[PDB]
Design a protein around this ligand. Structure first.
Ligand SMILES: CCCCCC(=O)OC[C@H](COP(=O)(O)O)OC(=O)CCCCC
Ligand SMILES: [Ca+2]
Length: 257
């Protein structure tokens, strides 16, 4: 019964086509699919104004998915813009941000569950000092990118958790839920960030499974930060945060990176 819509946080290099994506579903399991419906797409072009601008309309396909191209004459310049997509039939919606960047914008990636969770589920507990480390990278001039292997069906819950513990705003990306190979889906997403969006990814955080993702991107072991105690098989492939995030933060502020 309850709507479970999501829209993808989109990051895009200036001058390039701007495409917004969304998926529209009802139910806990997304049991109902919203097929063939009109969805109106709004952008808050003046991000602090609270005023929505209608940009156009699309129709969901058989899987409830939506792809919306921003008309060239309405392309947004550099900045971060709220986006809201509204189902015309019931006035339900999804929200996300459109982030427009200059070429070569520098970013840092955090794998959510691997980087931030301390326990399993019941809201997982957050690792101590995690938020401050992410906040340190943002205040230092880096675009924050959050990736997770979870399906975007779970986006509402994941974002609520990030927001509850006060994580900095960033670009959040999930798996489509259908690939069955999340590690490669993440690697490919981050590659697309570097190749199509032209981001310069300077550091990667996660747990042991993420080393293969960051390695596939071309990150060096010194730029790869992995939570927990050193693991022998991974010895030269990454930096282990053996002492925790608080200690790691002091090391970053003495200019470790
Ligand atoms: C743990 C995984 C994903 O973990 P992260 O990518 O580290 O956020 O959860 C599911 O895929 C579901
Ligand atoms: Ca989580």
């Amino acid at each position: 019964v309850t709507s479970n819509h999501r829209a993808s946080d989109t990051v895009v290099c200036e001058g390039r086509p701007q495409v917004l994506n969304g998926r529209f579903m009802y139910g806990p399991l997304d049991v109902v699919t919203l097929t063939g419906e009109k969805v109106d797409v709004y952008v808050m072009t003046q991000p602090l104004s609270g005023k929505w601008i209608h940009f156009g309309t699309e129709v969901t396909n058989s899987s409830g998915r939506l792809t919306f191209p921003v008309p060239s004459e309405r392309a947004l310049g550099i900045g971060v813009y709220p986006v809201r997509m509204v189902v015309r039939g019931d006035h339900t919606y999804a929200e996300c941000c459109l982030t427009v960047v200059s070429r070569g914008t520098e970013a840092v990636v955090f794998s959510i569950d691997g980087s931030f969770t301390a326990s399993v589920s019941s809201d997982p507990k957050v690792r101590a000092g995690a938020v401050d480390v992410v906040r340190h990278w943002q205040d230092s001039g880096y675009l924050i990118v959050y990736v997770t292997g979870r399906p975007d069906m779970q986006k509402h819950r994941v974002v609520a958790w990030l927001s509850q513990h006060n994580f900095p705003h960033g670009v959040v990306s999930f798996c489509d839920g259908l690939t069955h190979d999340p590690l490669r889906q993440k690697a490919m997403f981050l590659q697309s960030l570097v190749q199509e969006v032209e981001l310069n990814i300077v550091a990667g955080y996660g747990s042991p499974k993420d080393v293969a993702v960051y390695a596939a991107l071309g990150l060096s072991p010194s730029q790869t930060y992995i939570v927990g105690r050193a693991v022998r098989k991974l010895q030269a492939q990454c930096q282990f945060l053996s002492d925790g995030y608080v200690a790691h933060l002091g090391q970053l502020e003495a200019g470790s990176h």
